[model samples]
Target: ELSEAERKAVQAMWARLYANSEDVGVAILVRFFVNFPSAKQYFSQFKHMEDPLEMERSPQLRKHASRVMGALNTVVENLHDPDKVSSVLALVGKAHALKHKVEPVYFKILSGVILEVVAEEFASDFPPETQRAWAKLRGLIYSHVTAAYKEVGW
Candidate 1:
């Protein structure tokens, strides 16, 4: 469980990054990469993120990650808002339908990696409340991702 102060801290982190969606994308990718570097092998079929060219350090990539992080930040902050949740879920569903695989293992890897990164990078900055919120947020994404993935591709 996260403390009130910690939740605020997470929100503060969000305030700093939510304006851009790259942060959310970067955060997820970083989380995925850190925990499962081998996961890159799965994405090898893609063309854009092709080479291992300083993904984290690259100014370009960081900017992209920042955008992604921002999108996810918005999702975390608006979990209680049904309208917002629905919109995000639809977007994620479409994304899954497009090409992204939203398997249980995939969500687990992504969430676990992001939380681990957050724990290591912002351990002192986080509290139990914020941790709870983050965990809840992950669950939300995880479940919705599974649903989205289940929609098609059978």
Candidate 2:
């Protein structure tokens, strides 16, 4: 369960990101790619790029970044409802499996990248409890999504 404070912080963060979705989302993806170059191998479109910066400039990156932010927008909007989160994640899982062929573990790595990005973005304004809250949120999201990987497509 998210504490009221947690829900507020998360909502505020989400609102800010939603307002600048493409920029922040693409930045996070770029940071993720830099942090784990191996992740690029999973994206066929990105795999052939000679430089990681190429990914930053690609229109495809903009497209994907918007999609990712939109997904997070859904998750954020439903943070108070576990059932909704689960429902959304199940579809997200299936998409990951059928489309991306992404293994569950990658979400864990991405979550770590997410936490770092959040921390850096919020800095002193983000407290330890909120940090833990975000951690719990990420864990729960991946837990449910990864569980869906057991379905036939995966």
Candidate 3:
């Protein structure tokens, strides 16, 4: 569970990023695919696209990125209610584990990527304290999703 201060910090930072969520989301995935080329196998739509610039221009990529940001928005908005957070996380976990078949390790990897992207995008606002808070929040999200993965025999 996040401490009160951590929770507030996450919500505050997310509020700042929410307006440009799609761009941030796309950047996260672009960086992920570039840094971890093997991860691209999961996205068949534009996985064959070699250039990061081309990937950025992909409508499918943008659409999926928007959905990813929307999901993050849901998580940030519901942090005050653990049950709601867990419920949503479980849904994501089961979908990835059962339907998408995304490897569990990718969640951990993406958590770091999210922090990196956020820090880069909002450098002035991302002080150590805020970074630490977001790190903790990401860990909580990872734990919940992985726990659900286990529940589903993943």
Candidate 4:
């Protein structure tokens, strides 16, 4: 069972979103590491064609990173329209898919990671309840993303 305080803390954070979310460019590299660590497994080795490691280090990545943070910010704030967000989510999903197929369980892992990360960063304020609420919201968002994919006849 989660503590009420912890649950509340998580929800409070969810109300605002992680500051990193706004930076869309970082999702390809930095933020992805936090939200989806499982992807690292597929990138365990160096490959000739578009290896994740090689790709991240290339100049192309640095240039691409510029577009990340700003884009994510809009989505985190729920400030973008469906068309804008769909495009961003598609790109993020595609990049993540490179490491592995997007499985359902991954969403829970993501929420857990985010909760842990947020809790550790703001322990004094955030509590277990906070984590629970945040996780719930994330699950809702992920579900929405999935339905959106289905809407497109995926």
Candidate 5:
């Protein structure tokens, strides 16, 4: 549901930030955890580490965040390729279902954190239209992942 121009912008922006993916990914996840503290219950590994400083030093955050960035990299790279993108999302959706037992609503929460992190990271380079495009992608992710959740019986 993204316009070609918006897709181009998103692709370009992500390309420019690929090198910083780890940091941005960590920030996005941290934002999600911090802003939505209740969501932390989803991650049994991080449930006890409520202290921000401790989380900063935790390897789990870096590891999981890097995985997120990897999936996002795939999504960005295949933005114009519907089949590839669908495949990538399905793969991620399955992971969410089996591993995290993530609820569909959490994706919407994480999506907001992602947009906030993107805006912070890109600053003026993040155009309003590009935000809309990212929003569309987020919606797609939520729907697909949630569908997978249902497919797996939760």
Candidate 6:
């Protein structure tokens, strides 16, 4: 569970990125694919592209990134309510496990990439405490999502 300060920190920090969701979201996924090249196999559409610049321009990637950011936005918006958070996560977890077939490790990897991208894009707002708050939130998200994965036999 997050403290009140942590919750505020997360919501405040997320509000900063709320407007530029596509760019930030794309950046996170691009960095994820570049940093963890093997993870690209899951993204069949643009998996063949070796260049980061090319990946940045792909409409499919941008659309998928936007969806990812939208999901994060939902998670952040509902932080104060665990049931709502878990509801969103359960859907994502089951979808990834059953349809997407994404390895559970990628969720953890993407969480780290989110921090890195946010730190780079909004360096001024990401003080140590804020970063810690986001980290803890992401950890909670990962645990919930993974738990849902287990429920579906993934």
Give the TM-scores of the predictions, in the order they appear: 0.65, 0.91, 0.94, 0.46, 0.90, 0.95
Which stretches in model 5 have alpha-carbon errors above 4 Å? none
- Best lDDT among the predictions, by candidate number: 6
The predicted structure with the larger lDDT, 4 or 6, is 6
Which tens-of-lDDT digit does each residue in 1-154 have in candidate 3? 5778888888988988888887888888888888888888888788788899999988888887898788778899888888888899999999999998999999999888998888887788877778888888888999999999999998
lDDT of 4: 0.49
* Per-residue C-alpha lDDT of model 1 across residues 1-154, encoded as one tens digit per residue: 3346545666776664445445555765755665566555444333234344455555655654565565566676764465686678767666755755534466577668777766665677677776777787667677776676666552
Model with the higher lDDT, candidate 5 or 6: 6
Candidate 2 per-residue C-alpha lDDT over 24-135 given as tens digits, one digit per residue, 9 for 90 to 100: 8888888888778777787767866656678889887778788877777888888888788888889888888887788778788887887788788789778788887887
lDDT of 4 by residue, 34-56 (tens): 34555444333422323445555
Candidate 1 or 6, higher lDDT?
6
Query: Which candidate number maximizes TM-score?
Result: 6
Could you arrange the candidates by TM-score from highest to lowest? 6, 3, 2, 5, 1, 4
Off by over 4 Å in 6: none
Candidate 4 runs further than 4 Å off: 1-38, 41-72, 79-108
As a whole number from 0 to 100, the lDDT of residue 116 in candidate 4 is: 59
CA lDDT, candidate 1, residue 93: 63
Task: Give candidate 2's whole-model lDDT.
Answer: 0.80
Considering summed lDDT, which 10 consecutive residues are worst modelled in model 2? 44-53
For model 4, the run of ten residues with the poorest summed lDDT: 41-50
Cα miss at 148, model 1 (Å)?
1.4
> Could you tell me which 10 consecutive residues in candidate 5 have the lowest summed lDDT?
49-58
lDDT of each: 0.61, 0.80, 0.87, 0.49, 0.80, 0.88
